mmCIF file of C-alpha atoms and ligand atoms in Angstrom:
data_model
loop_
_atom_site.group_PDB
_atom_site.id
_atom_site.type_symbol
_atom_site.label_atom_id
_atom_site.label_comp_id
_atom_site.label_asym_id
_atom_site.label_seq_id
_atom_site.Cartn_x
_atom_site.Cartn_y
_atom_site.Cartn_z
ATOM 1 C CA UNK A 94 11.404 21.434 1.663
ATOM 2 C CA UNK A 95 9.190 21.701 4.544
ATOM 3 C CA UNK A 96 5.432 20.438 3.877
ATOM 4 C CA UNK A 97 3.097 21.921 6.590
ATOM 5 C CA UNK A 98 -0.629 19.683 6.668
ATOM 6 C CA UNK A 99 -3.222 21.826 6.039
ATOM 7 C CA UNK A 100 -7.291 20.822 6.940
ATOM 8 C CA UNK A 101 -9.302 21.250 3.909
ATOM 9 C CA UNK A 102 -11.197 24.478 4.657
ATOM 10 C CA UNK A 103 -14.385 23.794 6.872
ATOM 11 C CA UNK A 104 -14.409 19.929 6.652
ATOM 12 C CA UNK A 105 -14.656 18.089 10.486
ATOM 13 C CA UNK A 106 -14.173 13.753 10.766
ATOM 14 C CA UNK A 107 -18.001 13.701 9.120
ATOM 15 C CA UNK A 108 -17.176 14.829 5.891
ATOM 16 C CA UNK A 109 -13.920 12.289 5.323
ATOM 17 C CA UNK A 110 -16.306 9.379 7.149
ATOM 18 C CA UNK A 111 -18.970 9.993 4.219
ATOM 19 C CA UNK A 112 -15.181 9.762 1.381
ATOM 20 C CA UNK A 113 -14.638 6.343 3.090
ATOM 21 C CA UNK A 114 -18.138 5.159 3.008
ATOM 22 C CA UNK A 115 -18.350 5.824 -0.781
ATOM 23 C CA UNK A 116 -15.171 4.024 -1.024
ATOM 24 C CA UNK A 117 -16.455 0.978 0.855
ATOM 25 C CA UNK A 118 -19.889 0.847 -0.688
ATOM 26 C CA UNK A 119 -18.233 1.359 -4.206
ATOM 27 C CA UNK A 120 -16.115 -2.036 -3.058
ATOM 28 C CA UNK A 121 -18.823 -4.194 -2.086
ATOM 29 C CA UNK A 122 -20.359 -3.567 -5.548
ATOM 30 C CA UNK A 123 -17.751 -3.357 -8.176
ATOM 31 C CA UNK A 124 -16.748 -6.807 -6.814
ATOM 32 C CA UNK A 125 -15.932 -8.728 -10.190
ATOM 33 C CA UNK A 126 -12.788 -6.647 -10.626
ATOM 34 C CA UNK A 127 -9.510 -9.088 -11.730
ATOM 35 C CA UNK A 128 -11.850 -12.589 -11.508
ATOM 36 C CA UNK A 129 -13.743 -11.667 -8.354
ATOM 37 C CA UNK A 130 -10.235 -9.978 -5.987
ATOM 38 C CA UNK A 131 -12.220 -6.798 -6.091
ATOM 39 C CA UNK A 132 -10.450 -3.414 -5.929
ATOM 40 C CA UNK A 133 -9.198 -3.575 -2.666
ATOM 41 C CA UNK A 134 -5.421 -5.066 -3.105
ATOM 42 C CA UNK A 135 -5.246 -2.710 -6.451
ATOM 43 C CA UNK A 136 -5.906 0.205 -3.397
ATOM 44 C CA UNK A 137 -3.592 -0.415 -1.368
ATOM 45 C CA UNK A 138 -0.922 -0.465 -3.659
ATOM 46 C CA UNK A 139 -1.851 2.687 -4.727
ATOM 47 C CA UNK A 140 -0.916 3.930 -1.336
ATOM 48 C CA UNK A 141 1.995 2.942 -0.809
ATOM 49 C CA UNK A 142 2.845 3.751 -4.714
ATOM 50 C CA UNK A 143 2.449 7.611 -4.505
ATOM 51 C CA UNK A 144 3.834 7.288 -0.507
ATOM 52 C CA UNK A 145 6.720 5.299 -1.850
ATOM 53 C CA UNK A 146 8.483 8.094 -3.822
ATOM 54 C CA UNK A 147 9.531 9.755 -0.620
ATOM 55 C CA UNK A 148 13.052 10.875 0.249
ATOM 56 C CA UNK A 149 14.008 11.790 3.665
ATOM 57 C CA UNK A 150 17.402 13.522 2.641
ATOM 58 C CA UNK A 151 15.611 15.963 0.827
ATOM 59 C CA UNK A 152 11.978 15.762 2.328
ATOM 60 C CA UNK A 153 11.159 15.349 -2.068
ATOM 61 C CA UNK A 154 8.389 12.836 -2.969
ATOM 62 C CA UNK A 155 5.715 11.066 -0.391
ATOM 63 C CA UNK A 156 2.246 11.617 -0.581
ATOM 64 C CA UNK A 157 1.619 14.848 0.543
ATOM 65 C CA UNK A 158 1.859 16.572 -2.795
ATOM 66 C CA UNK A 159 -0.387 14.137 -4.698
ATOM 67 C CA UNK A 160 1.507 13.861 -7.764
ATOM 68 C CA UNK A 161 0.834 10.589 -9.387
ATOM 69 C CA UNK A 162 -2.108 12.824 -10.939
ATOM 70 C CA UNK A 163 0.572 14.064 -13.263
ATOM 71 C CA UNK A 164 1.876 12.125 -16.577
ATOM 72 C CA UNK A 165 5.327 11.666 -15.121
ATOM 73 C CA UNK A 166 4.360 9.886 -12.266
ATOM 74 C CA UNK A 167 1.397 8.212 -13.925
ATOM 75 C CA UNK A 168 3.384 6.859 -16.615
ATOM 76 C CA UNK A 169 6.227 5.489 -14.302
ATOM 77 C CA UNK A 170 6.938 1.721 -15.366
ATOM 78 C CA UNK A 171 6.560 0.858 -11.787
ATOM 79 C CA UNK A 172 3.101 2.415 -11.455
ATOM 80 C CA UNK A 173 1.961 -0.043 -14.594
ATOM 81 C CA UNK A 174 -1.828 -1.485 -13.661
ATOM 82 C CA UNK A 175 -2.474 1.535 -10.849
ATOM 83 C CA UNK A 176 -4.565 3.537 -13.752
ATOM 84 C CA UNK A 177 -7.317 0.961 -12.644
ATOM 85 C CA UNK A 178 -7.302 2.434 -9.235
ATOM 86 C CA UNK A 179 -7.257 5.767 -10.249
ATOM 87 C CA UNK A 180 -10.093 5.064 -12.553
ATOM 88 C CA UNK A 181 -12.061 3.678 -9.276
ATOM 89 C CA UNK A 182 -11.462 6.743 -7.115
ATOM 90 C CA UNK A 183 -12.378 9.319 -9.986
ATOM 91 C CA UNK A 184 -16.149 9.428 -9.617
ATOM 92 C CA UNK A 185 -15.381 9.728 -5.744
ATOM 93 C CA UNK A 186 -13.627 12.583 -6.575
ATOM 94 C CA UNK A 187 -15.874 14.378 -8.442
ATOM 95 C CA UNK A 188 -18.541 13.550 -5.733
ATOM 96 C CA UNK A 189 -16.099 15.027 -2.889
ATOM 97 C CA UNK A 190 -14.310 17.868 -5.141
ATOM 98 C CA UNK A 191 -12.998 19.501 -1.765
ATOM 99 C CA UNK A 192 -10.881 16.570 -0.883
ATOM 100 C CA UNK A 193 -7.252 16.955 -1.603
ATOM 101 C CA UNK A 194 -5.490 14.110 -4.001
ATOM 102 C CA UNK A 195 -2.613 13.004 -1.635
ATOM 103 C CA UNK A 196 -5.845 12.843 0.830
ATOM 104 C CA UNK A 197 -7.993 10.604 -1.531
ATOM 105 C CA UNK A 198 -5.260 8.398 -2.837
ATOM 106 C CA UNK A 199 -4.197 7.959 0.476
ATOM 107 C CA UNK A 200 -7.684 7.111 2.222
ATOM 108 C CA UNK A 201 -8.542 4.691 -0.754
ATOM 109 C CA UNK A 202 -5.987 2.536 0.859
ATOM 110 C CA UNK A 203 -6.666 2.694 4.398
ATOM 111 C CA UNK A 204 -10.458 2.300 3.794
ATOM 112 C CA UNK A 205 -9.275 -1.192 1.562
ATOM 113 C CA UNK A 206 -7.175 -2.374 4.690
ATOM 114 C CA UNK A 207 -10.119 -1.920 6.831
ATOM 115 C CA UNK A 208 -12.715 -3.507 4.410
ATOM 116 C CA UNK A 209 -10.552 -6.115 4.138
ATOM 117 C CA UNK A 210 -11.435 -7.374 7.413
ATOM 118 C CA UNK A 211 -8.064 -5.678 8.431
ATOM 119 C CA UNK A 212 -6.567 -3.878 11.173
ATOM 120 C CA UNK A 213 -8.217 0.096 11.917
ATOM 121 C CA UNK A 214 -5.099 2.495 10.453
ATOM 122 C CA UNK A 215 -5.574 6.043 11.868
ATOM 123 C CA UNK A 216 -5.500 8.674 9.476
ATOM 124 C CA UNK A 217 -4.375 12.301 9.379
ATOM 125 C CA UNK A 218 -6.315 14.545 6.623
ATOM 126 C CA UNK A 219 -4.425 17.787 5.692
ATOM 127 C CA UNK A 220 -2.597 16.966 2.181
ATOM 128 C CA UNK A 221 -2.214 19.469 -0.313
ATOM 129 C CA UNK A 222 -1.426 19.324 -3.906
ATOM 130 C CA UNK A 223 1.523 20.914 -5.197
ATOM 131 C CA UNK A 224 2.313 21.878 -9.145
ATOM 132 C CA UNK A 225 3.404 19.823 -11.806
ATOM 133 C CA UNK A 226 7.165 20.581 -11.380
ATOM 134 C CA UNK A 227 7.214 19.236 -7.748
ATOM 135 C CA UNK A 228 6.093 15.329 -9.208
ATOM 136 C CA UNK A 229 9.298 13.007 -8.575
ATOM 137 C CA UNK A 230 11.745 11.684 -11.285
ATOM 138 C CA UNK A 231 10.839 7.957 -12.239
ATOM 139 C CA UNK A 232 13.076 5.298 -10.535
ATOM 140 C CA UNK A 233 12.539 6.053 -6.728
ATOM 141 C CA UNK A 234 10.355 2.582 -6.422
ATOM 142 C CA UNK A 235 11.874 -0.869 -5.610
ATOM 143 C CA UNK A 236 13.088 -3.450 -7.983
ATOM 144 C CA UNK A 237 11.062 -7.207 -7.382
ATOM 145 C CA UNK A 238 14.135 -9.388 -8.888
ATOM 146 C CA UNK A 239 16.885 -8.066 -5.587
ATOM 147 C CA UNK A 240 18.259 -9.282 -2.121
ATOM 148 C CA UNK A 241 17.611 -8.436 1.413
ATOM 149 C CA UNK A 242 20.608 -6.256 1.581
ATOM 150 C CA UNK A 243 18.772 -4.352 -1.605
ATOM 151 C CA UNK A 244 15.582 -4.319 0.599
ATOM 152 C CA UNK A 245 17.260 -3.102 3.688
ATOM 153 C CA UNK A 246 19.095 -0.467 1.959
ATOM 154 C CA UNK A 247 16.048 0.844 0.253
ATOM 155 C CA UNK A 248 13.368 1.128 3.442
ATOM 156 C CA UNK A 249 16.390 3.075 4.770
ATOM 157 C CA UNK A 250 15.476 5.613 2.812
ATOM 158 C CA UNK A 251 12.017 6.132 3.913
ATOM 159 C CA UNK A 252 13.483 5.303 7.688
ATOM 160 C CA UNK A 253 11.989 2.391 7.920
ATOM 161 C CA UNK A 254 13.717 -0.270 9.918
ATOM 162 C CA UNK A 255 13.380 -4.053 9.956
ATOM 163 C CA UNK A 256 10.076 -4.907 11.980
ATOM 164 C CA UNK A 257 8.702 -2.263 9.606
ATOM 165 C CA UNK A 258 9.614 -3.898 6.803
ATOM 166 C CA UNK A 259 8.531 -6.935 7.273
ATOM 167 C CA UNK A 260 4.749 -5.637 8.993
ATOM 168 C CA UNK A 261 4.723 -4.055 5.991
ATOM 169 C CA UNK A 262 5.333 -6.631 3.294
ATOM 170 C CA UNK A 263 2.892 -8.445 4.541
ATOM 171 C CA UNK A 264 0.544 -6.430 2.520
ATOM 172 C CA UNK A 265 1.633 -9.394 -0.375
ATOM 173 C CA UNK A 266 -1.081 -11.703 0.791
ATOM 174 C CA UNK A 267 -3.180 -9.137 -1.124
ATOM 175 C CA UNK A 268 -4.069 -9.068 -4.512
ATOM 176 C CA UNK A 269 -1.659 -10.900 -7.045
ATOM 177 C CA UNK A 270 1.385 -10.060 -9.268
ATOM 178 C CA UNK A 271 -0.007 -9.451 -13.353
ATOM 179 C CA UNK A 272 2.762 -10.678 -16.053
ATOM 180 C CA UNK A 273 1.185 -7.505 -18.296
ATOM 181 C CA UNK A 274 1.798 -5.049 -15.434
ATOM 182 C CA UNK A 275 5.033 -6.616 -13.316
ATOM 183 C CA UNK A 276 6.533 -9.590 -15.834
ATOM 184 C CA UNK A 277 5.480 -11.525 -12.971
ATOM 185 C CA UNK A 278 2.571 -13.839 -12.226
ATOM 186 C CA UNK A 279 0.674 -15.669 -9.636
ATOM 187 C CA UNK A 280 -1.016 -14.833 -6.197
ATOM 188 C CA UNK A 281 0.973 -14.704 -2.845
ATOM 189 C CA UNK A 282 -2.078 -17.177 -1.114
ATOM 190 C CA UNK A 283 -5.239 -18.303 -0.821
ATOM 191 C CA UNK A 284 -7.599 -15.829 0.981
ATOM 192 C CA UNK A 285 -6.125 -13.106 -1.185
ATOM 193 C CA UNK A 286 -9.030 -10.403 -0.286
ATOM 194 C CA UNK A 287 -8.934 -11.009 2.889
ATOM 195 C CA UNK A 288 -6.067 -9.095 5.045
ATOM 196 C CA UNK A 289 -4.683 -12.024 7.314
ATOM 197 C CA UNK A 290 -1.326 -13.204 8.281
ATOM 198 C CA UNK A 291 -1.586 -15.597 5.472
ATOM 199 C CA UNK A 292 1.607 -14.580 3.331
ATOM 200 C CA UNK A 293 3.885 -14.979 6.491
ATOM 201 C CA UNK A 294 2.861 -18.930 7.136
ATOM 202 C CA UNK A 295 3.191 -19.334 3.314
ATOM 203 C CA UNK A 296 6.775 -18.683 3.058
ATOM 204 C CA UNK A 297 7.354 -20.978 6.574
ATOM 205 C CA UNK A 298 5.322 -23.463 4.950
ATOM 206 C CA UNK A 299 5.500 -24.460 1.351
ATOM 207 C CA UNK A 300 7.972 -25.988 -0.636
ATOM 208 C CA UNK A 301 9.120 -23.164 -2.841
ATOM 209 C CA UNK A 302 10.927 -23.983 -6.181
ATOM 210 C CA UNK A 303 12.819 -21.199 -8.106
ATOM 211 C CA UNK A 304 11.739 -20.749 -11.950
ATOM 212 C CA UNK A 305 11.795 -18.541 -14.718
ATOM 213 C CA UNK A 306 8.185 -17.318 -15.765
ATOM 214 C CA UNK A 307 7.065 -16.149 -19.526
ATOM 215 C CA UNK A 308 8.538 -13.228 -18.992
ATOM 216 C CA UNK A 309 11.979 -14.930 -18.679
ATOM 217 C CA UNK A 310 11.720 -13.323 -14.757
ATOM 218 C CA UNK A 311 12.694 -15.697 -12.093
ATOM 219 C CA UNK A 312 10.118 -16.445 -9.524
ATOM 220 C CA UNK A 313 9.653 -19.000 -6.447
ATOM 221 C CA UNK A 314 6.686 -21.050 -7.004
ATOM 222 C CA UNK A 315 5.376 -23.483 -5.242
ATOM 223 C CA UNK A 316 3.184 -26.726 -5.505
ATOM 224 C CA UNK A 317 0.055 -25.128 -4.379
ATOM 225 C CA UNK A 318 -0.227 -22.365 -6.896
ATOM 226 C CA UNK A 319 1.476 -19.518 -5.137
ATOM 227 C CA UNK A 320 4.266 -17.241 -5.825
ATOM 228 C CA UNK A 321 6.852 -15.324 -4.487
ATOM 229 C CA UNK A 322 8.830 -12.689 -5.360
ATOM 230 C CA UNK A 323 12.723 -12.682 -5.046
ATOM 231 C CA UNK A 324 12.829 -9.242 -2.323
ATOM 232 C CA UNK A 325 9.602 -11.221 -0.540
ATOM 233 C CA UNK A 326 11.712 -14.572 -0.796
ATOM 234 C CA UNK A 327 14.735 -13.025 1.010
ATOM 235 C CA UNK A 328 12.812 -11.998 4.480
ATOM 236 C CA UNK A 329 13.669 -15.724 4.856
ATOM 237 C CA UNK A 330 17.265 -15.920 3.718
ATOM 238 C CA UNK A 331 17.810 -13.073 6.261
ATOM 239 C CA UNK A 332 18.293 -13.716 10.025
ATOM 240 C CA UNK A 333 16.787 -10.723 11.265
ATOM 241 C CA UNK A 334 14.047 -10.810 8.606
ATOM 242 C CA UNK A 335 13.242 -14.566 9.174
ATOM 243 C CA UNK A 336 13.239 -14.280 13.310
ATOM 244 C CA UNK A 337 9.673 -11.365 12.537
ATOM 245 C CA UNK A 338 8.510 -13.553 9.960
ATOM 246 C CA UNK A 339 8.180 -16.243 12.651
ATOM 247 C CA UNK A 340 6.761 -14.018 15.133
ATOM 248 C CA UNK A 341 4.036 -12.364 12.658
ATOM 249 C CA UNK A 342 3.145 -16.147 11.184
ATOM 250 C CA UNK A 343 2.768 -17.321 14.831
ATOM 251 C CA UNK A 344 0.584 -14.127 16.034
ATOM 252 C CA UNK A 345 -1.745 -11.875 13.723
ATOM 253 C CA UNK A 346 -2.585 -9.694 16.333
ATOM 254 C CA UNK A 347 1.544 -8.582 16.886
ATOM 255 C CA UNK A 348 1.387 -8.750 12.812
ATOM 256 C CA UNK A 349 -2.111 -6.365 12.637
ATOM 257 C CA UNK A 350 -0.808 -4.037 15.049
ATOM 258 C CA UNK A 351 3.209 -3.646 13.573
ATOM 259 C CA UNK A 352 1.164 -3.145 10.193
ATOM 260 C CA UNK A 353 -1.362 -0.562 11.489
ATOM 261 C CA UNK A 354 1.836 1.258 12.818
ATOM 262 C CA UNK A 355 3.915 0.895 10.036
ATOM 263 C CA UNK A 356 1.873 1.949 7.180
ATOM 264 C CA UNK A 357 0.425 5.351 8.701
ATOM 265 C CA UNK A 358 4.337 5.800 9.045
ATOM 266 C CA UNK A 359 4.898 5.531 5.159
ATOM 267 C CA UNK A 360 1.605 7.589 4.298
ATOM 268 C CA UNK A 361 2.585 10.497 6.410
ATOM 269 C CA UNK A 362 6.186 10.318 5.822
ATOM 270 C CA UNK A 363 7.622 14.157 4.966
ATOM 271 C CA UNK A 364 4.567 15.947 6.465
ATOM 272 C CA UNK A 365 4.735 18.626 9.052
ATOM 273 C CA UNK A 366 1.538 18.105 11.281
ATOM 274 C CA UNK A 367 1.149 21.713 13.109
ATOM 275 C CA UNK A 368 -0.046 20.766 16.616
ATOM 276 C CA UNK A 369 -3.390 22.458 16.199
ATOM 277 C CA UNK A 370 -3.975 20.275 13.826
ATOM 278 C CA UNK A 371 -6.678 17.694 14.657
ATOM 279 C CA UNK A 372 -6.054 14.399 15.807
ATOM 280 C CA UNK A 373 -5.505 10.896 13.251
ATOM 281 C CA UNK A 374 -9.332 9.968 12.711
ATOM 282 C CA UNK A 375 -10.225 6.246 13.343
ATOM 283 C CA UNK A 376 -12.683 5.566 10.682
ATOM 284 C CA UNK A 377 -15.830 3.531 10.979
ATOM 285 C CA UNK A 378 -16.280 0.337 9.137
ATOM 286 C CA UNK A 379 -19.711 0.163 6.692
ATOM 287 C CA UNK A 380 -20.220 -3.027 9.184
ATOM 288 C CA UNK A 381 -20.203 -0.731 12.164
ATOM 289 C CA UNK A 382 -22.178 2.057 10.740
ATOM 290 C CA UNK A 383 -25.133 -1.114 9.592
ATOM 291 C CA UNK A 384 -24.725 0.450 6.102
HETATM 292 C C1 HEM B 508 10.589 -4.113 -1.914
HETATM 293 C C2 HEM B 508 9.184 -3.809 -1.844
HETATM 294 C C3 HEM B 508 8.221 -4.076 -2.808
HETATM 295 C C4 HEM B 508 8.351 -4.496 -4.119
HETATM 296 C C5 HEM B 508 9.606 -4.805 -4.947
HETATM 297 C C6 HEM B 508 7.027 -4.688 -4.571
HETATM 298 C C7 HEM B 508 6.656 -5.105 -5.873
HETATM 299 C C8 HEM B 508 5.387 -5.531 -6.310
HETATM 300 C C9 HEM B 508 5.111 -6.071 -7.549
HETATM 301 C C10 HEM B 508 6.162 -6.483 -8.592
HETATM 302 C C11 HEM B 508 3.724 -6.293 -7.585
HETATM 303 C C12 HEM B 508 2.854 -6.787 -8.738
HETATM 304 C C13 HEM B 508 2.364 -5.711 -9.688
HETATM 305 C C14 HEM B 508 1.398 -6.234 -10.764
HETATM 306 O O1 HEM B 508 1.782 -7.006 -11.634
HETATM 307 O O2 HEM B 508 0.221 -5.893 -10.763
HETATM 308 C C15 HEM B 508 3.271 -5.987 -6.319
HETATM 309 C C16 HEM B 508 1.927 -6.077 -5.920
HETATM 310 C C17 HEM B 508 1.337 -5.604 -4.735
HETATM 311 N N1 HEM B 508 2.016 -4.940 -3.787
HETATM 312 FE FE1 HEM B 508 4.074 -4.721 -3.658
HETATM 313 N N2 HEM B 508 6.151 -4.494 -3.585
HETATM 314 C C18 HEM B 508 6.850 -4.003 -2.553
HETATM 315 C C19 HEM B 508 6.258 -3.466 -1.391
HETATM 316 C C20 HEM B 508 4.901 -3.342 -1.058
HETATM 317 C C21 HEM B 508 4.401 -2.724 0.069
HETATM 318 C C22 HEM B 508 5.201 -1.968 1.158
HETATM 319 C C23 HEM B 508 3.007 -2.835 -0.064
HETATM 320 C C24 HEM B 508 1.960 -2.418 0.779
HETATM 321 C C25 HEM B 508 2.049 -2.120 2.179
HETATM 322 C C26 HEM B 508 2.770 -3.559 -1.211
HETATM 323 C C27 HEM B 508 1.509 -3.996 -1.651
HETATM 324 C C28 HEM B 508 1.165 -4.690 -2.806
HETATM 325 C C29 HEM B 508 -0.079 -5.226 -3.085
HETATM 326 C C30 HEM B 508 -1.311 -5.215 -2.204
HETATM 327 C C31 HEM B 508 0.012 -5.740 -4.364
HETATM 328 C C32 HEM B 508 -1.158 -6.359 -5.131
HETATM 329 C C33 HEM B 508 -1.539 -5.641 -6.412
HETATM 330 C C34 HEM B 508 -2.755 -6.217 -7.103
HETATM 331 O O3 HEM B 508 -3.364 -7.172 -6.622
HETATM 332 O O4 HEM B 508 -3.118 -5.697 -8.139
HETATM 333 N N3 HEM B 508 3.909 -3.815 -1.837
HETATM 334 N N4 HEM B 508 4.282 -5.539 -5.544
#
């Protein structure tokens, strides 16, 4: 498989900066979303859902075909609670019918990141979907209740290696886990809305206790109200895991900038970007713009 970006015919960096801004302005006002989190953790999971699939022995799967618009890959067990992003992005989508999906689903979480008081991620337009026969078999996404070894083995797959990892699950400071979606349940933190280094200095800093949940899953929880999965809990039972962990809990800047890296990685991983193809846009904030 080779997957060649193309540029949705006639569009320039104005048209995708007026796709983010109705992503960002739909944000700010559907803001009661899961007891006041918002959409914006329910985003980028999205993103790194339909990115996620992607297999680099076979160049099958990533997010250049946008897929998770078909039943397979919107019924996937892992993908369980991501039909309320969807739902969000749909009127955008009918307002911008020219954008491609891999290019919407994709944007919705980079806009997120950047709403989120986060770091800028560059972006690359030029997605294009593919037919229904072309959506990935169920069962490429990562098991919560696993090992670093299991974690190590699996970013292998999508080449990333260990400072990506761990820039990259730092995305768990976001959002929550839902026992209805996951069979797991509890927030990573505090300012979970807010993109900070936040879920790093929780696992250096509180006394986590292992337990079994309602769903008879095992979690770590600890006496502040926080949670952590098993695969988040083992970037500390991990020497090479641990030693970034340190590093990203003592400086968010390192942390913001492994991230930004990292996760423009894992959105454009299997696409061939022709070099006539226009630059990665950095996208304005609604801040920035005084809208
Ligand atoms: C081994 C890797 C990973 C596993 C096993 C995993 C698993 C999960 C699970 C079980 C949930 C909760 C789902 C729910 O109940 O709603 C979750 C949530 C989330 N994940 Fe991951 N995750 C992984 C990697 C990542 C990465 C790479 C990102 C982003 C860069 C990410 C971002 C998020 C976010 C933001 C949420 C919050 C969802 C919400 O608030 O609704 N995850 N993850």
């Amino acid at each position: 498989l080779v997957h060649v970006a193309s540029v949705e015919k006639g569009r320039s960096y104005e048209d995708f900066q007026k796709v983010y801004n109705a992503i960002a302005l739909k944000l700010r006002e559907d803001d009661e979303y899961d007891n006041y989190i918002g959409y914006g953790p329910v985003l980028v999971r999205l993103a790194w859902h339909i990115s996620g699939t992607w297999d680099k022995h076979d160049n099958t799967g990533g997010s250049y075909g946008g897929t998770y618009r078909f039943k397979k890959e919107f019924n996937d067990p892992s993908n369980a609670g991501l039909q309320n992003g969807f739902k969000f992005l749909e009127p955008i989508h009918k307002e911008f019918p020219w954008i491609s999906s891999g290019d919407l689903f994709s944007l919705g979480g980079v806009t997120a990141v950047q709403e989120m008081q986060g770091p800028k991620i560059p972006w690359r337009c030029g997605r294009v979907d593919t037919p229904e026969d072309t959506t990935p078999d169920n069962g490429r996404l990562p098991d919560a209740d696993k090992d670093a070894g299991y974690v190590r083995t699996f970013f292998q797959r999508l080449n990333m290696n260990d400072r990506e990892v761990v820039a990259l699950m730092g995305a768990h400071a976001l959002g929550k886990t839902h026992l209805k979606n996951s069979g797991y349940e509890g927030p990573g933190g505090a300012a979970n809305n807010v993109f900070t280094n936040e879920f790093y200095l929780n696992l250096l800093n509180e006394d986590w206790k292992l337990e079994k949940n309602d769903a008879n899953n095992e979690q770590w929880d600890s006496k502040s109200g926080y949670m952590m999965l098993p695969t988040n809990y083992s970037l500390i039972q991990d020497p090479k895991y641990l030693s970034i962990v340190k590093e990203y809990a003592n400086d968010q800047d390192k942390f913001f900038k492994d991230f930004s890296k990292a996760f423009e990685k894992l959105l454009e991983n299997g696409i061939t970007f022709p070099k006539d193809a226009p630059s990665p846009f950095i996208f304005k904030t609604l801040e920035e713009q005084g809208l």
